[model samples]
Structures are given as structure tokens and as C-alpha cells.
Target chain A: MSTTGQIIRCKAAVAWEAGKPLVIEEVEVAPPQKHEVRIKILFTSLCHTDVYFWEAKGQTPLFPRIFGHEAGGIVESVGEGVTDLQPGDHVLPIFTGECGECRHCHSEESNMCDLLRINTERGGMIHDGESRFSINGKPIYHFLGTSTFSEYTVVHSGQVAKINPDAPLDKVCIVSCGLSTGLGATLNVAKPKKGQSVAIFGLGAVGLGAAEGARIAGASRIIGVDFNSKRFDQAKEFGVTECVNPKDHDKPIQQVIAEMTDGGVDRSVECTGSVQAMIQAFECVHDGWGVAVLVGVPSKDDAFKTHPMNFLNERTLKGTFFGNYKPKTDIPGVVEKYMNKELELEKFITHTVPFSEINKAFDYMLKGESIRCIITMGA
Target chain B: MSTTGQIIRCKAAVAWEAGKPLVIEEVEVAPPQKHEVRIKILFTSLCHTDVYFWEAKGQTPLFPRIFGHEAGGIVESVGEGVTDLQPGDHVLPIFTGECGECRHCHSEESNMCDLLRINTERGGMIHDGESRFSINGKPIYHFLGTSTFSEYTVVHSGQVAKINPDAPLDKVCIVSCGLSTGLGATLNVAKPKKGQSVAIFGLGAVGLGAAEGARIAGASRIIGVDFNSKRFDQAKEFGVTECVNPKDHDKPIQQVIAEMTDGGVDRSVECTGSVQAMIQAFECVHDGWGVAVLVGVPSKDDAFKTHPMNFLNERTLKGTFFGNYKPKTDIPGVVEKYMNKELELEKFITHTVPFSEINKAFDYMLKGESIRCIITMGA
Candidate 1:
């Protein structure tokens, strides 16, 4: 068995420059350092955040970076002081990490650990402020603390979740980010009770996952809103009772939804990155007990604008990171449910491609042709 | 006793025009129509909302209106459909009325009734869409649902709360708005657990009431913040452990608070109408479980702006209407607490004056000279 202190050569899809397509090339992966873990990526899926950073549209961009956050992998090694994880353990890479000692991690109300926060924007290892990936002699940057676009990635132990070994990596990888965010948002953040109504804006994997969540929570009505009419068919499979396209309405989408729902949905989730969708999600909830959970990542420069009176009417607006899940704890539990056939993981995988064809995944995502595309690493 | 079908002529302080001093005049108080109750107001207090509407700074002003909303009164006559309330019952007139049948009023989460929504802006009775008051046969408007500035005012049965007769109406009348709004905001909206930390902005009657609520909740740290340093001493008397003057710090108030509390307060209440203050209050809570409730009413044109990322950290922003109290149910309960000596109602009354000095009450509120000024009606 390979020990913690060994380096290995690996293949990774690297974004060498801003606005450039990722190039599949050889890279050197260093062994996990103190409080870190080295994982062999098995299956990975693209999330919108990866594309947002890769396109370099919002904040200042980092280049020569490995950019994937959602993935199912196997632990290749564990660094010193990492007692919980060991080599050959199945795991999932998570963007939002949890250091159990942090104030946030200690609190039952949140999963965000300030010390283990994803500094993907900074693109450096959180501990030593250095990169583990390198092409020839030059170091490659990290993204979202996961870097699962690579065949083998080094992650802080706090950011890796040891999952059930029996769970298929390809089938559950999507849960690492998109699926869990949507599911946990509805179940944890919005918490739509039985017989309640839920509205999910955006028909991508996240929105559909939220629909499934609402369904799991026994919601009487799960309304789906998407710009693409084509997404509605699949949304029905996820238990959406009604679907509406914002373009179909002459009035504001919220007003239209409010009218259709008697008042509005009990809970709404914003899975689209559009600020307008976030505002609509907030406004389209019942005045008395409506809760809107923001699961989408809006551009850094973007601000949510709403008349403060909307809040005065007893509507609550909240944001969730990784669906407010404690990555190390909750991700495995979700995987256990998936393994038991309690969650529908296979339905979200609309396409699969070799890791070498990873750029095609981005193309499919950009054209809205795929819900979630799995990349089989080491192909 | 005056019966339901009898019209009553009464004295009222009327805002004859915008931005003008109210005139003491004789107004025709109409008979209690079906579902309405005529009350002889015994005591009332000034709230900043009265001053805001009277100044008519934000929206177009409605005038030739009666403008007070906080009061303790006696039911003089009950309408045909009103069976519960009888003549001589001590009651508190609430601004946010609850029509038992509306979806909002029926929901446990909110106090606002869609049908009985304060038509203070519309200046008409919600049922008939007509003013119940008139001067020389010309209709004078109703301000909010309860026009307590008048000696005798008509309110929907749903808008009145029968209170404990033993409780001093003069003192607890302030509970009708300011005190209840602040206290319930903490107890009902924020709902901070024991040993939690709370931050309150604007040290007025409302803010002090929130501090008192925090104390009752066993909050370990109650931090009071205001631009006015003068309010800090009194805030401490209400269990405020520390006080901060934003003007004293060069950095943004949020940053100062964040630094003081390590990661910010557990809960925060914005009691100032300033939009900037509202934003500051929201930003200064612990990222994971921090809840900021907006208690102050802002201008219609004002919208709260925050970087969407702040919410993404698991923070929640919510607003409360009359501190989320079901006026007819919760107000009487609050009065019971005061009657049991579990609440401090006397310390908040800084001044007491006759009804003719009502204009001076607004002056004292505007200048921050009073926490609450009791106005004895029919003096």
C-alpha cells in the first residue's frame, strides 16, 4: 500500500489561461501534507461555479488551475495527523469543507468552517499557501479546494468526505456539489413541510434536485420554473407538479406565480445564477410563511435588490453553502441513502464522457443540453 | 351606552393638510357599522411612524386625517356582527389588524391580514373603502387601521385586542406599537436561544424593548448600538451588556461589530428606518446561524442592497410586522406578562401629557427627547 509521503504522476485537464479551453496534459501530484489527503479521482461532474471561474467573468481569475469541485473518488493516501481517513478509502471531494474545531462547525445550525473555507479564488493550498499540482517545473493553481478535474488531487482532510465503498463513484459523484446543494437547500434551508408548496427556479440539476428534495419532504405541490421548455419533461420525473416559463408571462414571473398559487409557494429555491431569478424566487413565496433559499452563485458584483417591505410581510430570505451540509458528515449519509435506492442519482446523469473530452462537458453545459455530465477519470 | 346605529360627534386632533400642525377640532364619528367597533380612546403614545407619515417625506402625503396608531381604549359600542367585545371592555388598538379569515391572518407565521391590511396609506376603512371620520360633512381620512388620535375612533373587531383591565392603560398603551414591536421582534422573530448574543440598533423605545426581550430570553451578550451615545446608559438598564456608537468608529459599523463579537452577533434587530442601518444590522451577525430581523419601517423607495455572497454563508434576513404578533391574541398575552410584573412597562414612559399636547409628543420623538410619551385622552 502506498504511504502518505509519496508523489505520483497524473493527468489533469488544466485551464492554462483565462477564457481558454482546458487542456488535457501530464502533471505531477505531490503527496498529502499535514492535515491533507491525496485522492484518486474516479468520477467527476461539472458545476456552474467551475465554469464561472474558468470563464473568468466575475472576479480576478487564476490560471493554470484544475477546476472541478463535484466528484467521487478513492483516498490514495492520508497526511500526518489525519486519523479519520486512510489509503484506499472511498470518498467524495467537497468545495465547502468542515474543520470540526471552528465555531461554525461546532454550531448545529451551519456547516461552514471559517478555517476550512474554499479559497479557490486564491488558488492555493489552504495550509501552506502553495499548490500541489505542477506541469514540468511550473506549479498549477487549485480551484474550489477540490480540484477533482485531475485524475489525482490533494485536498485538505477537512474538505474530503469518506463515503461508502460499495456506492458507485460515477453514479454518486454528482451529489458532491449540485445534487446535495439542491436537495439540502429544500430539506435543510427552506424545509418545506408535508402538504406545503415549493417553487424551484432553474431546471438544471440543482433545481431538479430541489424538486426531488421537496418531493422527499412530502410537498403537495412542486412547481418548476425554467426558461427552456424542454427541461420540463425531465422535471416531471423529479416530481414537479407544475412548470412555468417566465417568458410565457406578460406580468412579472412572481406575480404570475403568486396568482397561480392562491398567494404563493410556501418555499422557493433559486438555483439559477441570475439575480433576477433570485429576486423572483424571494417574491413568489406565501407572505406569512414563505422562505426563499438562495442556492445559486450570483456574480460577485451582483446585488439582490428588493423593497425591504417584502421582508416585513414575514417572508424570509436566506443563503446556503453546500446546502448547509457538513460535508464530511452529511455527504456520506446522502451516499448511504443513494446506495439504499432511497435517492435517484442515476436519473441526473444525462451524459457521460471520457476525462480527455472534458471540454465537451462544458460545451454541453453552456448550450443547456445536459443536466449533469459525468467525466470518467483515468480514461 | 352608545348603540351600534347611533352616530357620535367627538373631538379629534386632525391633520388638515400636509406638513401642517394638527388642529384640535370637532369631527363626526360615524356609528359602528356591521363588523366595526367604536372605542373611546383612554390613552395613547407617539411612535416614529406617526411622525414619518405626518411629515410625508417619502410618498405622497394623505391629509385631513387622524394619525395616531398606539392606544389603549374602552369599547363604547359594538357593531351588529361583533359578539365578543362589549361596551366598557378595555382594549388596545393595533395598527396591524387580523381578519380571521384571510390567509395571512389564518397562518400562524404572520399577523398581517390581507383584507384588514392597514389602509393608513389609502385613508379609508377597508370594508367600505370609505373614511369613517368627517369635518363639516367633508370626509377626514383614517391613518393606519387605528386612528387613536381621536377621542372616539372606529376599528374593525379584528383590529382590537381586549386587555387586562387592571393594567394601567396610560402606561401599557405604548405596548400597542413601539414596545410590542421591539419586544416581540426578539421573542417571536429572532427567537434567540439562551446564552446567545444579540445586537440591537437604534436605542429608542423599540430598541430598548428588544433589549428587554433579549434579557428575558437569557441572552449572554446584549449589545446596543446607536449613533446617539445618550441612549446607551438607559440601554444598559434593560440588560444591554455593551453599547457601541457607530459614529465613534471610523470603520463601517458592521466591521466594528464583527471584530467585537469575533464572528458577529447571533441575532440583530434594525430599529432605525435608515436603509444603511438596516444593511449594517444584517451584515453584523454570525455567518452560519445569524438572523437579522428588520423591525423599523423604511421608505418605499428604499431597497436593501447587500453582496449576495453574504447570504451564501448561511446568514438569514427576515422582517417582522408588529413583531409577528397576532394582535388580537398576542397583545393580550403581552399585557398579561406586564400585569404579572414579568415585563417592564413603566420605565419606558419618559413623559406624560394631555391629549392637546400630542403635537409636542411628535416634537419630542423627532428630537429624541423621549422614549415614550403617554397622551391622556379626554383630558
Candidate 2:
């Protein structure tokens, strides 16, 4: 295109250190390497995880690290080995991939493509022990793998799956992580049959995804529990059949769930890490077939407890990670279902700011002012 | 062949009050009720649960109650309309008979029979708030319906399932509960397939049953763990392929399980109620397809915990109740297998006690000195 125009520079908002706000700066763009592709970012978002990592732990030690996990954009350029798409192809940037060859991917083909095990403690993974991108010859660690806060970012070909050109990039970005995990837990793990019921302990985006997935699985009722009753109606939008405010109920939530479902729910999902909610999940499923799945992370010492008699009743307690969603295959599969209008995933995105104001977007999410905040990188 | 001289009168054990053991007082034995059968007690076994109500909690407000869940004897008489068995039929009165109409009895079919639910708490079901047996005009509560501690007891038609005449009544008596729960947990719930690996947290009779079931299921490796190392050999004799002493290993039991199975146990049976052990059980299953099932009852306040990531790795946490076994259906099936030597169940009996010293048997079990104990009744 006109003998390769001078490398365009784009600005992004990032933290210079932990607890810092978005500081906008321009960085030099770079070309893609083999098996790599560059995306013109159109959206970015912060999930509760991001808030915990940055605010609670400042998860990454690498300074100037790009911090958004989910993103979506157009394929502007392809590395030498890339041929699946043209410049105008609409695509989504998934932080992880489902390389069918991985052990976990092979065993659970439904979760068939998730192997991001490169140590989040030590951000990027390259054979040469360095990330592919640089600015002013200085190193920058990639966040998750997508780095969606930047206007443009490069990732392995396996990380991006082709999608409908008509679908909004803003929505797909959120689908990359939060929504997918939530829905995947219900559809893939719980997979409630028709006339069955599901009890969810969290009403955030992931919980919303699970509720909607339960609906898709033909669950007759979806009960959502949250400390904040303010979201009672919001949960309804994601197919929640009933919402319980745990703040008001002192009796065991299990009793409440049992009563509401006419017994315990056939399956329950615990998306909140609170120790109290975890116990409720264990007791709130049907006596024998009911399964409570944990989607939230608890501290090292806190435990989910129940009487040994619980098992005698055939109640099962389990843990679920990433909703066990394999990014590559599941992300695209979700996108496919999205194209069919089977799932309204974009509803979770209550705020969308451009990449230049990504920091402010995270704030809205952190303060619970937004269900989710999306950052739109200029195309 | 002499017709028994006038009815045989003998000193009988009676619980006149909660805290007091039965005073060996002479009482007249009553004939079986209509549709009821009178059983001549021979070998009655003590169960830990027997100690729980009588010796442990003491005289539990329901006084004049005789407790003995395990008893094997010969049917001396059948009440009107009883056609299942004739005189001299060897029988073991099921403490609780499945009512057959209750949801659990029909669908799950194996929990204590529905009519027996009130027996454990109040000594007997009150159709019109009355007792079925009396001593000198005082009410006599039948503990779990059988009340084997007594010389003779009354039962309903559905309460007894005739077994092979040759099987040892003393050895098979405990199988009514502990032994069956373990085997059922394995065959009915865990259902270990060929090449699967199993880990058990206790080496009690129930745990051994699980090991035998796992072996019968063709599991490649069966690991047994206990805080007490004395049961290692017993675990192996029952089919455990590996043994572990929690005290000897410094690592968390979960970590040890993970390393031993080269990742984690494929299936785990938690027979101890220690919340810490429960957490280990939840975490010991590997990242993909590992299942931890709880068969033990923990104290009321204790908690069990696991990381949500564990579930994302495709690990499942579940509880096993009554081994998910249906007594009317599964008991017959398992008993048939037991008769054919397809299942080794009799070896579970480790103690045999008389009704006079029943309290001593409880101490034996509390000290982990016995696997299962049985109390012999009068013939």
C-alpha cells in the first residue's frame, strides 16, 4: 500500500506501576513475525479478575505491561505463514488458543484448545525468552496474550479465530474471556437438561453467561444469588428465572435453594469466591444428581465444608476453572452461536471507551459502576 | 422333636431410661403382629451407630428403646398375610425397610426405607401416634425397627430380604450398612472402569469394600491412605495396590496423591470426615477427569475447600451416599454377587460382641480397634 507507509503510532492508557491510573503514551508500531498477525483493535474490556490482579495484587512484575485480556478487531496484516485471512477479514483476538495437540485439549475436545500455562507469574512465553514487541528498543511484557488495551497488538495465529465480518468487535472482545467462561460452564460442564434447574451464586458477567447458557441448555429455572439486590433485574436479562438476595436471608442458602427449586437445584454454580456461598453450592443441588461447581477463587485457607452425610445424599461438590472453556475452539463456537442470535453476549458490556481512555474504563468496572467496560482501539 | 415346653422365658435387655443400659429383667415375649414376623435372634452385631444413640448420646430422650441395627436369626413365626418366609427361615431384619413408594426408595431406592425414618429418632413410626410393642403397659420403642438388642422383635413384611441359607449370619450382618455403603459407593457411584486408579482415605470396612469394588472394577491401581499406618496390610488384602501413611509423608495428602498417580488419583473415596482431609480429597484428583467422592460425614461445623481452577481442569468433587445403592434392587444384586464370590463382603466383620457388653464394642470402634462389630441375639 504505497510502498509501506511510515509506521503509524497509536496511544494507549496503562499503569506505570501498581495502583496507578491510565497514563497515555505513544509507542512505535512493529511488523508481524512468522505465524503472527496484527489486529486493528476495536474493543477492550476489564473483568473482575483484572481488578483483583491490578488492585489487589498488581499481578505482573513487568512494568509497562499491556493489561487487557479480551479484545476484537480486524485483520490488518499477516505474518509470512498466515493465510487464513485477508486484510479486510473481520476477526477476534483470543488471549489463548486451543491447539488440538495439547494433552488437555485432546482429552476434552470441548475444552480442546486451552494451554496458557506459561506462568502468569512470568508474563510472556517465547522460545528466545523475550516478547515479540518493543518500543524504543525497550521490552514490554504482554498481558494474558491479547493486550487489547493497545490500539494494535500481535499474537500467534492460533490465538485468533475467524468470525463473522458483521458482528461487532466491541461485543466479541467481552466474549473472549468473561462471557465465554460463564456460559461454557453451564453449557459444557453443567449442561442442564430441559426442565432441570440451575442455581448461580454470582450475578456478574460470568454468572450471567452461565445463566444464559443454562437457558440454552433448556433449564426450566435459573436462580441467581447476589449480595447486591440492585442487580436483581439485570440478572433477569441473562435468563435468570429467580434472583435471591443473600443479604436478607440468614437461614442456610441451601434451604432456600431447596425450597425454591422444590428441592435442591439439579445443578448449581458458585461464581463467588466467598466461603459462605461455596457451602451453599454444596448443599443446594438435588440430593443425588445435583452438582455444585465453583467458578470463583477462594483464598488459600478458606474451605467449602459440608457434613459427610451430604455425600450419602449424593450431593457432589466440584471446582471449575475458566469454566473449563478452551479459548480457540470454544471462543469461535460461541461466536458461531452468537451469529445465530442464540446468545446476546454483548449485553454485559455497559461501558466502552476508546483505547486512549482504557484506564478510566477499568475504574468504572472496579467501582461496580459498569457490568463490564470495553476499550475501543481506533481502527 | 419336642414342642417347645410352654413359651421360653428369659432375661431380656430393656432400656427403661436414656442413660441406663437395659436391666436384665424377665419380660414375656410377644408373638409377631399381623403381617409381622417374629425372629429368633442368634448373632447380633454392634455398630458404631449403635453406640452413637445409646452409649454416646446416652438414653436419648426416647426411653425404653432397645437399639441394635445388626441382627441375624431364624424366623420362628410369620404373622397373618405373611408369605415370603416360613418357620426356620434364616433371616436378618433390615433395620430400615424401603417403603418402596417414597421418592428416594423408588428412584434411588436404597436409603433407609421410608417407614424406618422415624424409627432412629423416635424408635418407631407412629401411624396414629402409638407403639407396636409394650412391656408391662410401658411403651417399647424399636430402635431402627429391628432392635436386635432385644431377644425378639417385630417387623413389617417388606423389612427382611432372605439371604443364602449357608452364608454366615454373624459375618454378613454388618454388610447391612457399613460394608454395603463402601461397595455401593464404588460400584454404584464411583463405578471405576478398567484401567482407572483409586485412592481411599480410610481403611475401615467401608473403605475396604471400596477397594474390593475398585479391584473388581478392574482398576489398575488402588491406593489406601490413613492417618493410622496399622491398616496398611488390611488395605492391601482388600485390594489396595498402594498404601500411604499421612503422618509419614510431610506433603499434603493431595500432593502425595498427585505425585503417586503421576498426576492425581483418577478416583478418590473420602471416608474420613476431617475437613482438612476432605480438602485433600477434593484436590488430589488430577486436572482432567479426576473424581473425588465423599462418603464420610464430617462434624457439623467443619468445612471443605478446593480451588476453582481444579474444576476448570476437569476435576470433579462429589459425595457418595449409601453408595447410591438401591437396597431392594442393588442389595439383591450385590448379595447375589456376594453369594457367588463375585464380591468379597464377609471379610469386613472384625468384631463380634454380646448385647450385655455392647458398650465395650463402641469403645473398640472409637479407638479404631475394629472394622465392624456384630451383637449376637438369643436363639
Q: Which candidate ranks first by lDDT, i.e. highest?
A: 1
What is the C-alpha DockQ of each candidate? 0.80, 0.38
TM-score of each: 0.95, 0.85
- The TM-score leader among the candidates is 1
TM-score of chain A of each: 0.96, 0.90
Please list the residue runs of candidate 1 whose C-alpha ends up more than 4 Å from where it truly belongs after superposition.
A2-4, A19-23, A57-61, B2-10, B19-21, B26-28, B56-63, B122-124, B127-139
lDDT, candidate 2, at B177: 71
> Model 2, chain A: how large is the TM-score?
0.90
* Candidate 1 displacement at residue A172 in angstroms: 1.2
True contacts kept of 1: 0.90
Interface RMSD of 1: 0.9
| Pairs clashing within candidate 1 | B120-B144
| Model 2 CAPRI quality | acceptable
How accurately is candidate 1 docked according to DockQ?
0.80
lDDT by residue (tens digit), candidate 1, A109-128: 79878888766676878879
